[PDB]
C-alpha cells in the first residue's frame, strides 16, 4: 500500500549509511574511526554559551524571528571577505549537505550525467542519487582525480557538473596538486563545464600553505563556472549546521530559490552564533585545528605502521581527517567491519563511497574524534582484527 | 550558458514571493500585513538565553556535534506524548518547510497528480512544484475544502496525496468543521488515499476548544494514511527552524531517509533549546499565545469594519494569523498593492497562493506581527488605498 503510494524518489533513497553512522556517539563504549566527527576538545563551549546568551538577550527578536533566505548579513560579509567575493555572491546553507541537495535540484534530471570520483563523498552520492542521474566516475588517488581518465570521459559525455574535493578528499584524503588543478581548470574552461568544488577540509592542511582552490584559479582566469562550497562543520561545529555556497549570480539565484523551498532559511541563532565566535581570532583558531589534526593523523599513521601487516595498503594524508585503507583484492571490508566491532572499534567500509559499486576491499579510517592513546588503542584492536583475517 | 547548464528543476523553482516576504525588515515606515511573522512580544528571549547557555555549558559536546537524523530523543518523546504517538513515529525537521520538501521528494514525480486547495499555502506549492506535478485543486472556503468538488476530482483522478490545512488555513484562515473532517476521512479511507495534514496553527484557536485533527480521527478509526506535520514556529519561534512530521513507519522511514540527504540532521542546540523551553509550562504558554492572537484578530476586524467600504469582502477568522480579502471581480490586488505602497502599507497579493493561477482580486492580511495600534493605523492606510481604487 505504501510501496505503491511512493513516487520514484522513494526508490532512490534506500542507502542508510549516513543515518547509521550518525548513531555513532554511543554511551560511549565505541573507539570510533567511523564518521569524520570533529575534535570535541576543539568545541568552544564556554564562548558559545556566552555568545548565545548575549544574542538571545540582546538580539533575540532577530535570532528568533523568520529571516532572509540568503543568510545573516554579517555572516555573508564575513564569508565574502574570507573567500574574496562580495556578500551578494554568498548563500548561507544548513550545512554543505543542503548545498549538495540544492545543486542536485538545480542541475540534475532523471538520467542526467554527473561526474564524480570513484570513490567520492557519500553525502554527495546520496544527495545526487535522489534525482536519478547517471553517475560517471574517474578514479581518485593520493594526488587527486585521474585526469587522463577524465579526458576520455569528456570526449564522450557532457556532465551537468563535475563534483570534486581537491583538498583532502572524503574518503581518500587525496590532495590535487597545483599543476593538476591548473590542467583541470583548462579542461573545464575548454568545454564550458560546471564544477562543484567541495572545500569542507580547506583549512585542515598539514603543509606550510593551502593550495589555491579551483574557485580561486577560475576567478583569476575570469571563468564563472565554479560553484564553491564551504562549511563551518570541520572548523568549528557540525552540530550547528552552518555552511555556504559561492557562485556566479545566475547559479546563485537558482540555489537561493531552491533553498527557500527547502527550509525557508538557515536557523538565525546558529548563523549569528557562528559569526560571534569567528569574527575575531579566526586565524589563530584555524592554526590550532591544523595543529590538532596533524597530531591525530601522525598518531594514526605511526600506530598503523607499527600494528598493520604490509599486505594491506593505506594512504598518508597531507591534511583532512581520513586515512584510506586497501585490503588485498578478495578480502571484504564489511567482513573486516564485523570483527572490528567485536573488538569495540568502528570504521566505514568503502562500498558506499563508490557510486556505481565496487571498492569492496577498501575502508575509511577517521582520526578526528579520538585523542592519541584512543587512536593508538583503537588501531591496536584493529591490528588484532586484520591479522586474524589475513591468517 | 547558465540557463543552458540548468536542469528541469531550475525551471520549476522560478517562484520567489517568500524571499521578498522574509526581507520585510523594510525599515521602518511601512506597516506590513504581509507574512505570518509570529508576534515578537511572545518571544521568551530571557528564558531562551538562559536555557541556551546552560545547554552549551552542560551539554556542549552533544549540542555542537553531528547528531542522528531522527532527532533529539527527548524532543521526539515530548512530541510523541503531546500528539499521542510513539517517539519513533516522530521525525524532527528543520521547519515544516523541510517536511513539505521531503514529502514532495518521496511522493511526487514529473506529471504526478497532487491535490490541494485553491488557494493554499505557497510554501507547500513551492516545495511540491519542484517535482513537476500536475496540481489538482478544489476551492477553499470559510468551512475548508469544497467536498463536492473533491468528489468530482476523485472520480477522474488519483492524487498521490491530498495536502490540507484544516485548522486556520494559510491563506484563508478557513476552519474545516468536525462534520466536514469526518466526511473528508470517509472519502480518503474509501479510496486508500494519503493525506498530508499541515497543522502549523493547531494551538492558535480563538474559541473554547480545538477540533480533533484529521490525524486524530484517522487514528481513532485505525487508518494509517495521514502524515501529520506540526511546527514550533507559530507557538514559540519560527527562527529556530524546528518542527516535526508524524506518520506510519513505512512513510516516516522514507522521510528520515530523504532527510539524510537534505541536511544530515536538524541542529541539535535548536532541538535542545525548544525542548528545554517547553518541558514545563507549555499549556500555560499556549494560553498566552491564544490570548495575544485573539486580541490582534479582534483589533484587525474592528479596524476593517471601521475603515473598509462594503463592496470589498473579508473573512473573520476563528483562529490563526490571517484575514483573507476579496475585491470586486474586475479589480486587481496587485494594483492595490502598488496604491497601498503610495499610502505606505503592505500585504501579500493572492495570486501566488493559487497553484494553477487565479485569485487576482484576492489578498492575504496578517495581524500577527504588528501591535494593536499598528494594526489600526495600517488598516486606516489600507482603507484609503482601497477607496482610491474603488472611486
Ligand atoms: C563533511 C563534508 C561535507 C558535509 O558537511 P556539512 O556538515 O553538511 O556542512 C561536505 N563535503 C565533504 C567532502 C565533507 O566530508
Ligand atoms: C507558517 C506555516 C508553516 C510553518 O512553517 P515552518 O517551516 O515550520 O516555519 C507550515 N505550513 C503553513 C500552512 C504555515 O502557514
Ligand atoms: C553524516 C556523517 C556520517 C558525515 C561526516 N561529514 C563524515 O563524512 O564522516
UniProtKB/Swiss-Prot annotation, chains A, B:
Q: What is the effect of changing residue 19 to A?
A: Strongly decreases the affinity for AAA and Glu. A mild decrease of affinity is observed for 2-oxoglutarate which has the same chain length as Glu, but differs by the presence of a 2-oxo group which is not recognized by R-19
Which cofactors?
pyridoxal 5'-phosphate
Q: What does this protein do?
A: Catalyzes the transfer of an amino group between 2-oxoadipate (2-OA) and glutamate (Glu) to yield alpha-aminodipate (AAA). It can also transaminate glutamate, leucine, and aromatic amino acids. It also contributes in the biosynthesis of other amino acids such as leucine.
The protein's Enzyme Commission number: 2.6.1.39
The record's section on CDD domains has: AAT_like
Gene3D superfamilies according to UniProt:
Aspartate Aminotransferase, domain 1, Type I PLP-dependent aspartate aminotransferase-like (Major domain)
- InterPro entries noted in UniProt: Aminotransferase_I/II_large, Class-I_PLP-dep_aminotransf, PyrdxlP-dep_Trfase, PyrdxlP-dep_Trfase_major, PyrdxlP-dep_Trfase_small
What keywords are annotated for this sequence in UniProt?
Answer: Aminotransferase, Pyridoxal phosphate, Transferase
Residues at which substrate binds: 36, 170, 364
The reply to whether Transferase figures as a keyword in the UniProt entry is yes
Q: Which family does it belong to?
A: Belongs to the class-I pyridoxal-phosphate-dependent aminotransferase family.
Pathway terms, separated by semicolons = Amino-acid biosynthesis; L-lysine biosynthesis via AAA pathway; L-alpha-aminoadipate from 2-oxoglutarate: step 5/5
N6-(pyridoxal phosphate)lysine sites (modified residues) = 259
Query: How does this protein assemble?
Result: Homodimer.
The record's GO molecular-function terms, alphabetically, read:
2-aminoadipate transaminase activity; pyridoxal phosphate binding
The name of this protein is 2-aminoadipate transaminase
Which reaction(s) does the protein catalyse, per the Swiss-Prot or TrEMBL entry? L-2-aminoadipate + 2-oxoglutarate = 2-oxoadipate + L-glutamate
Q: Does the keyword Transferase apply?
A: yes
The Gene Ontology biological process terms listed for this entry are: lysine biosynthetic process via aminoadipic acid
Other facts noted in the record for this chain: Catalysis proceeds by a classical ping-pong bi-bi reaction mechanism.
Domain of life, per the record? Bacteria
Record-marked site positions (Recognizes the side-chain carboxyl group of acidic compounds): 19
Quote the record's binding site residues for pyridoxal 5'-phosphate: 66, 96-97, 170, 198-201, 231-233, 241
Amino acid at each position: 500500500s505504501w510501496s505503491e503510494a511512493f513516487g520514484k524518489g522513494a526508490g532512490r533513497i534506500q542507502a542508510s549509511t549516513i543515518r547509521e553512522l550518525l548513531k555513532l556517539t554511543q554511551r560511549p563504549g565505541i573507539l570510533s574511526f567511523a564518521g569524520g566527527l570533529p575534535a570535541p576538545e576543539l568545541f568552544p563551549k564556554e564562548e558559545a554559551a556566552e555568545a548565545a546568551a548575549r544574542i538571545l538577550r540582546e538580539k533575540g527578536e532577530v535570532a528568533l524571528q523568520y529571516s532572509p533566505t540568503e543568510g545573516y548579513a554579517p555572516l555573508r560579509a564575513f564569508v565574502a571577505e574570507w573567500i574574496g567575493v562580495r556578500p551578494e555572491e554568498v548563500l548561507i546553507t544548513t550545512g554543505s549537505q543542503q548545498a549538495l541537495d540544492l545543486v542536485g535540484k538545480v542541475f540534475l534530471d532523471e538520467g542526467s550525467p554527473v561526474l564524480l570520483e570513484a570513490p567520492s563523498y557519500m553525502g554527495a552520492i546520496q544527495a545526487f542519487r535522489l534525482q536519478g542521474p547517471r553517475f560517471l566516475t574517474v578514479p581518485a588517488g593520493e594526488e587527486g582525480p585521474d585526469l587522463d581518465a577524465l579526458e576520455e570521459v569528456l570526449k564522450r559525455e557532457r556532465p551537468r557538473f563535475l563534483y570534486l574535493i581537491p583538498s583532502f578528499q572524503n574518503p581518500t584524503g587525496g590532495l590535487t596538486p597545483l599543476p593538476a588543478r591548473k590542467r583541470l581548470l583548462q579542461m573545464v574552461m575548454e568545454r564550458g563545464l560546471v564544477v562543484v568544488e567541495d572545500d569542507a577540509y580547506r583549512e585542515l592542511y598539514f603543509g606550510e600553505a593551502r593550495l589555491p582552490s579551483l574557485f580561486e584559479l577560475a576567478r583569476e582566469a575570469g571563468y564563472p563556472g565554479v560553484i564553491y562550497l564551504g562549511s563551518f562543520s570541520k572548523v568549528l561545529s557540525p552540530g550547528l549546521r552552518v555552511a555556504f555556497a559561492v557562485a556566479h549570480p545566475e547559479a546563485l539565484q537558482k540555489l537561493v530559490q531552491a533553498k527557500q523551498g527547502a527550509d525557508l532559511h538557515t536557523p538565525m541563532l546558529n548563523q549569528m552564533l557562528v559569526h560571534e565566535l569567528l569574527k575575531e581570532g579566526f586565524s589563530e583558531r584555524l592554526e590550532r585545528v591544523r595543529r590538532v589534526y596533524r597530531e591525530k593523523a601522525q598518531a594514526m599513521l605511526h600506530a598503523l605502521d607499527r600494528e598493520v601487516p604490509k599486505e594491506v595498503r593505506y594512504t598518508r594524508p597531507k591534511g583532512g581527517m581520513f586515512v584510506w585503507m586497501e585490503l588485498p583484492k578478495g578480502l571484504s571490508a564489511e567482513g573486516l567491519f564485523r570483527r572490528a566491532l567485536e573488538e569495540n572499534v568502528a570504521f566505514v567500509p568503502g562500498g558506499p563511497f563508490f557510486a556505481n559499486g565496487g571498492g569492496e576491499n577498501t575502508l575509511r579510517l577517521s582520526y578526528a574524534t579520538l585523542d592519541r592513546e584512543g587512536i593508538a588503542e583503537g588501531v591496536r584492536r584493529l591490528g588484532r582484527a586484520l591479522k586474524g583475517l589475513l591468517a
